[PDB]
Design a protein around this ligand. Structure first.
Ligand code: NAG
Ligand code: NAG
Ligand code: NAG
Ligand code: NAG
Ligand code: NAG
Ligand code: NAG
Ligand code: NAG
Ligand code: NAG
Ligand code: NAG
Ligand code: NAG
Ligand code: NAG
Ligand code: NAG
Lengths: 50, 460, 371, 49, 50
């Protein structure tokens, strides 16, 4: 009965990886547990239409 | 099988009803030789305890042992744990201090109790706090041990929740406190619910302090564990009238049904192990005339009865020495200064007869307070949006507020239930901003008869 | 006007030393008319008649403090438990002297037990001081014994809370097994070389054999254990140059007993200056009522401050363990235990002896094999 | 981030019917008129444009 | 001015009912009006409260 991590973060916490090199979304929840470098990309959110 | 049930008590329960508790019971006897010995005891001194142990184990090698206690002495269970480490006999602690929660059982023992752990009780207390949306709280912990796992369990429970608890940092104690720096931590508490972890002797000074500190207010809630709230007789005058306690002493279950269920668990594990291997009962001869490394058993019931089902009751045990589905009791202290039972505990959920939480606003008798307001409203779409509660959380989303509505069934009946629902909207935001600014409390519910209002012959 | 002091002890010479220290207890306290009766009880083959003889003899003696002073226990589980259980039934403080099991550390399990020796979590704090000396931040934790290992890991996290570092690897498992060698090779794949081990003698011997067959004690590797891993066949399977610890006046008994009797006598003469002083009842023949000033005299034991003794400043912590003891840091210089460090209460003082390492040079290994 | 939004719980309880594993699934779903909106980072959808 | 309700003492304080008025203080800056011998007791009590 526990909240645990999955995906690239869950496999990084298990030590299966060494450094996430990916378009990783920076937010409060990830920064509580792992560390971030200074970002390379800056963008917001948008809606895709047809 | 060969089981000796002894009861060291002062509440006089005689011996012939124990013979009536075994005679017609267990009509389907799967072991070929089931023999019990029912014995009573007046004192609780360990000399006579080990004397009865050595008389019963030398009494034709009795393989079962069940013990209950009247008083609140937990060291009796520690002596029984040592005897279980020595004699390798399954020992059951029923009531009193015989089943009170000790810290850490041993893998080298075969001892069990009938109760709820401090972590299960913490889960039930946080379920109580979650069902009332009292999310703004604190945590007072003294230096009585078992506190580190307690604080860690609170942290792992809050951090694994969909609630988003307003969790104030942990207020701790150091010694018998100077009341110079601990009060500075107590003045950090601007919350309502104050979570206390201490002992019963500490709690008298703690509640006398908080009454002298004025922390026993009408909005100041207090929820305490089971070890600090002892037997129903001894109630000191320093308790707030409205104190919330949780203990598993169910008044709908006496000692005889509990030891009947324990004998059912013993016979069930014995009958389930009797089909795997045949010669299951293997005890030691006696206490006297011993050498080093006696005949230790290889097939034990200690690592066998993890799951059990007795007459529908799920009395299955854990891998640590506790139960899976215990019977938690949630009591409050009424204006009659008696422990009023309110909440019974289901397999998973909390049944609440008084789920609509009342005031009991005279927590102390010298408290003139008028900060609760009975506020009613009518459901309209742009102002009063009323929704069902989230079943994934059993909790309204915190932009909304709790409410209740009197809902009947049909025109045949007239009695209904006050179903709790969620409220958001325009005037709901108005009410929240008024409660932020004026700093009052309110009692939100819905109207029953119908629409806004109209006078029909001086009847609004 | 009487004070009774019990002790479970074997040798008649240490019983005479105990009675001599009882005679020297009222040596400096003036013409105070207190009486002092001593009680000394011997061994039994099991622990059941041990508990019986000790419980009825110390109830019939009505003692205040109970001394546990047994190194040569034939039961290798080291359980003087039922004496402490019986005195915790009436909340009576038992002073142990020898064993360092963490089952006595929890005061919920042992309600009225203190001892004059600290657990191995303090040796983990000493290992944190060794990290402070050698500028190390990454450790690999290997724990066999789960009865003490969770408390040792909790004290290790208490150490790492200030530095805000974390252990690179933690392992707790079932004692008695032999293949942890896959996990040892996974620890080989990590970056740091600092290896921390806590086990009995046989498990330490098994993992030393596993580390030697996989030559895990070679160049750059760090190995650092305590006292329960440097004796028996673990000492036979130990690599040369391994670093261990040793208790100054831990294995010694007589001066330790004298310091214990001095502590107990000064605590009793401190306690006699207050009101509502109670006595142990006749708990064997029908007295289930607990002793009244149990937590009060326990707080007196908590507030016990000293500045004298053979070991020196004896002092007790929040758990009732020995504050600020004397430690020795031993080196296995070619199957010979050679002392290469001393340790007072907070500072590691290396002497003139050289630290030969199991790998290459005698210099300190910067064992950070970065990826 | 939308779960922390206390007033946008409707979107959080509605997107569970349409949560997709990869973004190419979302592109093909909005291409085949199964979707009508898609909250996403900007430059990825700019390159897809 | 965000002034809280004025703390009023009664006598040489019992530190039971006056302490409620003392624990009303959740602000920073405190203004005290008393005599010289009273202020020693007041500030010693305030040090005992923190
Ligand atoms: C407890 O005391 C009474 C009287 O001393 C004695 O008969 C017996 O030992 C106990 N009571 C029972 C079990 O009859
Ligand atoms: C109950 O116990 C058995 C013992 O073999 C175990 O294998 C099984 O998983 C359990 N089954 C149930 C009913 O959960
Ligand atoms: C409680 O729920 C469990 C499944 O979650 C079910 O097996 C059981 O029947 C329920 N309660 C009882 C003890 O009847
Ligand atoms: C009671 O009311 C409900 C809701 O109007 C309705 O569904 C139900 O059929 C009624 N029951 C009867 C038939 O009395
Ligand atoms: C019950 O009866 C009253 C009067 O006949 C009627 O107005 C009402 O609609 C009935 N209840 C419902 C909600 O069906
Ligand atoms: C201590 O008192 C007991 C009381 O019976 C007595 O038997 C004993 O002689 C005294 N001390 C010793 C061990 O000589
Ligand atoms: C495990 O132990 C066995 C002996 O019990 C040995 O044959 C084997 O090499 C060991 N290694 C593995 C596979 O873990
Ligand atoms: C021993 O060490 C040498 C040199 O590092 C290496 O070649 C060899 O594989 C090692 N043996 C084992 C079994 O680790
Ligand atoms: C223990 O210490 C005492 C006092 O220093 C000493 O007389 C005795 O010889 C020591 N025991 C040993 C190391 O044999
Ligand atoms: C100590 O003795 C006296 C007897 O009146 C009294 O001060 C007090 O009741 C006793 N101690 C306590 C705090 O109970
Ligand atoms: C052992 O520690 C004590 C602590 O007071 C100290 O007095 C003593 O000098 C130490 N032993 C040594 C370094 O000889
Ligand atoms: C040994 O103890 C003394 C106590 O003052 C102090 O010098 C220090 O803690 C230790 N040694 C040194 C010189 O660091």
């Amino acid at each position: 009965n526990k909240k645990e991590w999955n995906g690239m973060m869950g496999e990084l916490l298990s030590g299966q990886a060494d450094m996430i090199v990916a378009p990783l979304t920076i937010n409060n929840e990830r920064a509580q547990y792992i560390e971030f470098s200074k970002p390379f990309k800056y963008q917001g959110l948008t809606i895709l239409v047809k | 099988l060969n089981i000796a049930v002894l009861l060291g008590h002062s509440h006089d329960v005689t011996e012939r009803e124990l013979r009536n508790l075994w005679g017609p019971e267990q009509a389907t006897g799967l072991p070929l030789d089931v023999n019990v010995v029912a014995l009573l005891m007046n004192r609780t001194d360990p000399k006579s305890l080990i004397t009865h142990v050595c008389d019963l184990m030398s009494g034709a090698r009795i393989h079962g042992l069940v013990f209950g206690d009247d008083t609140d002495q937990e060291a009796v269970a520690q002596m029984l744990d040592f005897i279980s480490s020595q004699t390798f006999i399954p020992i059951l602690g029923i009531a009193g201090g015989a089943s009170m929660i000790m810290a850490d059982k041993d893998p080298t023992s075969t001892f069990f109790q009938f109760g709820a752990s401090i972590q299960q009780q913490a889960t039930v207390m946080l379920k109580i706090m979650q069902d009332y949306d009292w999310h703004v709280f604190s945590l007072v912990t003294t230096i009585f041990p078992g506190y580190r796992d307690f604080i860690s369990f609170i942290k792992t429970t809050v951090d694994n929740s969909f609630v988003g608890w307003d969790m104030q940092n942990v207020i701790t104690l150091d010694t018998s406190f100077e009341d110079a720096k601990t009060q500075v931590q107590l003045k950090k508490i601007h919350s309502s619910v104050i979570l206390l972890y201490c002992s019963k002797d500490e709690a008298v000074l703690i509640l006398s302090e908080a009454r002298s500190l004025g922390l026993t207010g009408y909005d100041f809630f207090w929820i305490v564990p089971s070890l600090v709230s002892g037997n129903t007789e001894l109630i000191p005058k320093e308790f707030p009238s409205g104190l919330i306690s949780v203990s598993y002493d169910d008044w709908d279950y006496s000692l005889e049904a509990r030891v009947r269920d324990g004998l059912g668990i013993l016979t069930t594990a014995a009958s389930s192990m009797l089909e795997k291997f045949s010669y299951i009962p293997e005890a030691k001869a006696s206490c006297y005339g011993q050498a080093e490394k006696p005949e230790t058993p290889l097939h034990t019931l200690h690592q066998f009865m993890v799951n059990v089902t007795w007459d529908g009751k799920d009395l299955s045990f854990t891998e640590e020495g506790y139960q899976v589905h215990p019977r938690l009791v949630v009591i409050v202290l009424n204006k009659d200064r008696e422990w009023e039972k309110v909440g019974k505990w289901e397999n998973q959920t909390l049944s609440l007869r008084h789920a609509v939480w009342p005031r009991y606003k005279s927590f102390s008798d010298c408290e003139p307070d008028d900060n609760h307001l009975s506020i009613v409203t009518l459901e309209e779409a742009p102002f009063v949006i009323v929704e069902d509660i989230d079943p994934l959380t059993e909790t309204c989303v915190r932009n909304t507020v709790p409410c209740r509505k009197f809902v009947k069934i049909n025109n045949s009946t007239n009695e209904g239930m006050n179903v709790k629902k969620c409220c958001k909207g325009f005037c709901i935001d108005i009410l929240k901003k008024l409660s932020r600014t004026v700093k009052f409390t309110y009692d939100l519910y819905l109207v029953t008869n119908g629409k806004h209002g109209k006078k029909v012959n001086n009847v609004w | 006007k009487i004070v009774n002091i019990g002790a479970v002890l074997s040798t008649r010479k240490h019983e005479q030393m105990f009675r001599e220290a009882v005679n020297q207890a009222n040596k400096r306290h003036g013409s105070w008319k207190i009486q002092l009766n001593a009680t000394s009880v011997t061994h039994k083959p099991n622990a059941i008649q041990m508990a019986l003889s000790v419980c009825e003899d110390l109830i019939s003696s009505q003692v205040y403090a109970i001394l546990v002073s047994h190194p040569p226990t034939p039961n290798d589980h080291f359980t003087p438990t039922p004496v402490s259980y019986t005195a915790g039934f009436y909340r009576i403080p038992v002073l142990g002297l020898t064993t360092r099991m963490s089952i006595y550390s929890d005061k919920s399990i042992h309600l009225s037990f203190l001892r004059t020796v600290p657990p191995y979590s303090h040796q983990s704090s000493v290992w944190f001081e060794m990290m402070r000396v050698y500028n190390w931040n990454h450790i690999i934790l290997l724990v066999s014994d789960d009865h003490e290992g969770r408390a040792a890991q909790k004290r290790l996290e208490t150490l790492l809370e200030e530095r805000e570092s974390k252990a690179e690897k933690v392992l707790q498992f079932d004692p008695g097994t032999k293949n942890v060698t896959a996990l040892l090779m996974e620890a080989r794949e990590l970056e740091a070389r600092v290896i921390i081990l806590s086990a009995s003698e046989d498990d330490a011997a098994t993992v030393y054999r596993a580390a030697a067959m996989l030559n895990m004690t070679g160049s750059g590797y760090v190995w650092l254990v305590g006292e329960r891993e440097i004796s028996g066949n673990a000492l036979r399977y130990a690599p040369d140059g391994i670093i261990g610890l040793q208790l100054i006046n831990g294995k010694n008994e007589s001066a330790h007993i004298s310091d214990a009797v001095g502590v107990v006598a000064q605590a009793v003469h401190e306690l006699l200056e207050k009101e509502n002083i109670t006595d142990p009842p006749r708990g064997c023949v029908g007295n289930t009522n607990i002793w009244k000033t149990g937590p009060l005299f326990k707080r007196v034991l908590m507030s016990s401050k000293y500045a004298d003794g053979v070991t020196g400043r004896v002092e007790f912590n929040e758990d009732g363990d020995r504050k600020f003891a004397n430690y020795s840091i031993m080196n296995l210089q070619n199957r010979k235990l050679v002392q290469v460090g001393i340790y007072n209460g907070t500072h590691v003082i290396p002497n003139d002896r050289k630290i030969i390492w199991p790998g290459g040079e005698t210099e300190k290994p910067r064992g950070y094999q970065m990826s | 981030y939308f779960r922390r939004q206390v007033e946008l719980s409707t979107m959080y309880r509605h997107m569970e019917k349409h949560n997709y594993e990869s973004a190419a699934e979302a592109i093909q779903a909005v291409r085949d008129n199964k979707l009508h909106a898609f909250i996403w980072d900007s430059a990825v959808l700019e390159f897809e444009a």
